[PDB]
Design a protein around this ligand. Structure first.
Ligand SMILES: Cc1onc(-c2ccc(O)cc2O)c1-c1ccccc1
Length: 207
């Protein structure tokens, strides 16, 4: 396992998300499903000129898996996936510049729900999760596990777990007061409200 320090700007973003009083936490799901949709578009685009890109899996979907016993909400997609370099470089984002633009917008009157307009929507996971684990597999690299409970650092390791073919799995270890996001009715409500125009099947698993 390798441990890395977040860039100062990203540690500042995470602290703002964790510490700011902001009741509209539900937007984390829209942000994560939006990232999944973007990753699925990328592999579909590459497959148009190279059909062998889909040898690691032809299905393009998003699965939402709540687990009440482990207190986790997992979002699985079969998108392009991230390489080790992508994971280290802020999960494939330009997060340093995105954070700068987002923080300026917040000072001017914008609110936390607009985070996605700054290309740093992933970090909204910290509105509801005490720890986030990202398992990812890109065609050109091995399967990795990224993890962070914030606190200024993240870890990366080769994942020896269940092989995923291709794509990304985001495991949200929920905060104790955020268990409403494991309830079927609550998840359905959020998906219908914010993700009605996502062009891939979104399957809400049951227990
Ligand atoms: C590329 C890529 O490959 N997997 C993800 C991914 C990142 C986060 C996530 O929640 C789900 C995902 O599929 C992304 C990605 C990187 C930056 C912006 C949007 C997608």
């Amino acid at each position: 396992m390798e441990t890395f320090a977040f860039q100062a700007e990203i540690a500042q973003l995470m602290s703002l998300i964790i510490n700011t009083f902001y009741s509209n936490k539900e937007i984390f799901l829209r942000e994560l499903i939006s990232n999944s949709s973007d990753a699925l578009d990328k592999i579909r685009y590459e497959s148009l000129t190279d059909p062998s890109k889909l040898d690691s899996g032809k299905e393009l979907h998003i699965n939402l898996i709540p687990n009440k016993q482990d207190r986790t909400l997992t979002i699985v997609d079969t998108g392009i996936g991230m390489t080790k370099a992508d994971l280290i470089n802020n999960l494939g984002t330009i997060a340093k510049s995105g954070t700068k633009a987002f923080m300026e917008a917040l000072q001017a009157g914008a609110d936390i729900s607009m985070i996605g307009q700054f290309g740093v929507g992933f970090y909204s996971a910290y509105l509801v999760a005490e720890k986030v684990t990202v398992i990812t597999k890109h065609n050109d690299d091995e399967q990795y596990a990224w993890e962070s409970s914030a606190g200024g650092s993240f870890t990366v390791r080769t994942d020896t777990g269940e092989p995923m073919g291709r794509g990304t799995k985001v495991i949200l270890h929920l905060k104790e007061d955020q268990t409403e996001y494991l309830e079927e009715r609550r998840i359905k409500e959020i998906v219908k409200k914010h993700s009605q125009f996502i062009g891939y099947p979104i399957t809400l698993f049951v227990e």
